[PDB]
């Protein structure tokens, strides 16, 4: 992976250039936003369990998946489901706090669509679950940090779809 | 199923089924009709076990019934008895299977993580299954409710 800093050093490095004013403006941008990203990651760290509980209650609640034959019907598949929402929340936080979604390219979205199309996991319900985490999370961290988390949850949703 | 609990065993040992194991399979397939009597009785008496076990559950444990409890509300209370119906059905699968694999893989694998993700106290679930064990032992014979009651005991040991 890489953060925003590493990505700047990658483009400047791979052209052979030094750091010019543009790249320093990008590093200024990240260093301005850093503390906001830190407190957002702190609050998500605090309330992860309730984000997953409220997002499953919004998104998978009152649905046929719960009923016999749906994909969440057993205890093993329920636990695997909420486990995957834990992964989405956690890597979305890493992607937010790095400022670069390369993490999501490397360790989440690789092979995931082939996996869910292999197993029989409904992609639509997954995407709606992630958007429920996006709404609850934005409600916890506020406007700015909710926009930041919104680009990474939307990145995962764009990856699965 | 009991049959599976042998093929996997000597499969991982990469040998044919052992003679001792083979005798059990014979004892299993000859004990079949008694097992189907047991699961027949627990099948056709499910409403009494779920209702009466739910009554003894809520009378022993007034935590959930009360407002602010996990099970409070008309929709919520119904679900609680829906889960007791699930375990009761599973117990019947475990009886005809001759093994708790059906009970374990449908009901017990990862149960603590689910009810902790629901906010449900799992000790109340175990008290409910114990209540259904008392009712189901009231509906059967001596040795019969020893057997079926011990399947319920496995589920209690998995919840606790």
């Amino acid at each position: 992976m890489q953060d925003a800093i590493t990505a700047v050093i990658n483009t400047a490095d791979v052209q052979g250039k030094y750091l010019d004013d543009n790249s320093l403006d990008k590093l200024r941008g990240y260093f301005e936003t850093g503390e906001l990203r830190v407190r957002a990651a702190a609050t998500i760290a605090a309330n992860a369990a309730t984000i997953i509980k409220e997002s499953v209650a919004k998104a998978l609640l009152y649905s046929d998946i719960t009923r016999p034959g749906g994909n969440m019907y057993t205890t093993r598949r329920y636990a695997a489901c909420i486990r995957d929402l834990d992964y989405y929340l956690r890597y979305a936080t890493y992607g937010m706090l790095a400022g670069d979604p390369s993490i999501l390219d490397e360790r989440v979205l690789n092979g995931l669509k082939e996996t869910y199309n292999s197993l029989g996991v409904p992609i639509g319900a997954t995407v709606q679950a992630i958007q429920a985490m996006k709404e609850v999370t934005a409600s916890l961290v506020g406007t700015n940090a909710g926009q930041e988390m919104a680009v990474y949850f939307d990145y995962i949703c764009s990856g699965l779809s | 199923s009991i049959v599976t609990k042998s093929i996997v065993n000597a499969d991982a040992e990469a040998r044919y089924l052992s003679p001792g194991e083979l005798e059990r399979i014979k004892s299993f397939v000859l004990s079949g009709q008694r097992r189907l009597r047991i699961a027949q009785t627990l099948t056709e008496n499910r409403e009494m076990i779920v209702k009466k076990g739910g009554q003894q559950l809520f009378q022993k444990r007034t935590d959930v019934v009360s407002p602010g409890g996990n099970a409070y509300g008309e929709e919520m209370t119904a679900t609680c008895l829906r889960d007791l119906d699930y375990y009761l059905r599973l117990v019947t699968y475990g009886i005809v299977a001759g093994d708790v694999t059906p009970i374990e893989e449908i009901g017990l694998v990862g149960v603590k993580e689910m009810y902790n993700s629901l906010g449900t106290p799992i000790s109340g679930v175990s008290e409910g299954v114990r209540c259904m064990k008392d009712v189901a032992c009231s509906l059967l014979s001596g040795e019969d409710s020893a057997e079926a009651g011990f399947y319920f005991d496995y589920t209690l040991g998995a919840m606790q």
């Binding site: 034959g69 057993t74 093993r76 598949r77 197993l119 029989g120 | 699968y93 694999t101 059906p102 893989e105």
Partner: peptide, 9 residues
């Protein structure tokens, strides 16, 4: 496994 997810069912 005893509980298996077929699309058919």
């Amino acid at each position: 496994g005893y509980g298996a997810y077929s699309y058919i069912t």
